[PDB]
């Protein structure tokens, strides 16, 4: 599964909200990735996520592969909204 988002947070995706995003991903059996500006990282790996330096206004893409991919995508959508990160 895949879904592209627009980052609406002033502080982009960093610090605690990024942490919460990684935690949501980690709940799922699926392998999950986050992409920004042509670089893809494992969304379950916080170092790699923090390394993307995703700023406000960014286009990002989340991909998931696995038995529960659709449920992961929906939970990640929810987290991005609850944390005021993206839509």
Swiss-Prot record:
**Example of a GO cellular component annotation carried by this entry:** cytoplasm
Where in the cell is the protein located? Cytoplasm
Q: What protein does this entry describe?
A: Phosphocarrier protein HPr
Residue(s) carrying Phosphoserine: 11, 45
Q: How is its activity regulated?
A: Phosphorylation on Ser-45 inhibits the phosphoryl transfer from enzyme I to HPr.
CDD domains reported for this sequence: PTS-HPr_like
Q: Has the keyword Transcription been applied to this entry? A: yes
The protein's role, per its UniProt record: General (non sugar-specific) component of the phosphoenolpyruvate-dependent sugar phosphotransferase system (sugar PTS). This major carbohydrate active-transport system catalyzes the phosphorylation of incoming sugar substrates concomitantly with their translocation across the cell membrane. The phosphoryl group from phosphoenolpyruvate (PEP) is transferred to the phosphoryl carrier protein HPr by enzyme I. Phospho-HPr then transfers it to the PTS EIIA domain.
Question: What family does the database annotate?
Answer: Belongs to the HPr family.
**What gene is behind this protein?**
ptsH
């Amino acid at each position: 599964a895949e879904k592209t988002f627009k980052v609406v947070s002033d502080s982009g995706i960093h610090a605690r909200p990024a942490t919460i995003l990684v935690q949501t991903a980690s709940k799922f059996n699926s392998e999950i990735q986050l992409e920004y500006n042509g670089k893809t990282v494992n969304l379950k790996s916080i170092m790699g996520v923090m390394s993307l330096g995703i700023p406000k206004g960014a286009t990002i893409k989340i991909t998931a592969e696995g038995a529960d991919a659709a449920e992961a995508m929906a939970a990640l959508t929810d987290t991005l909204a609850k944390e005021g990160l993206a839509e």
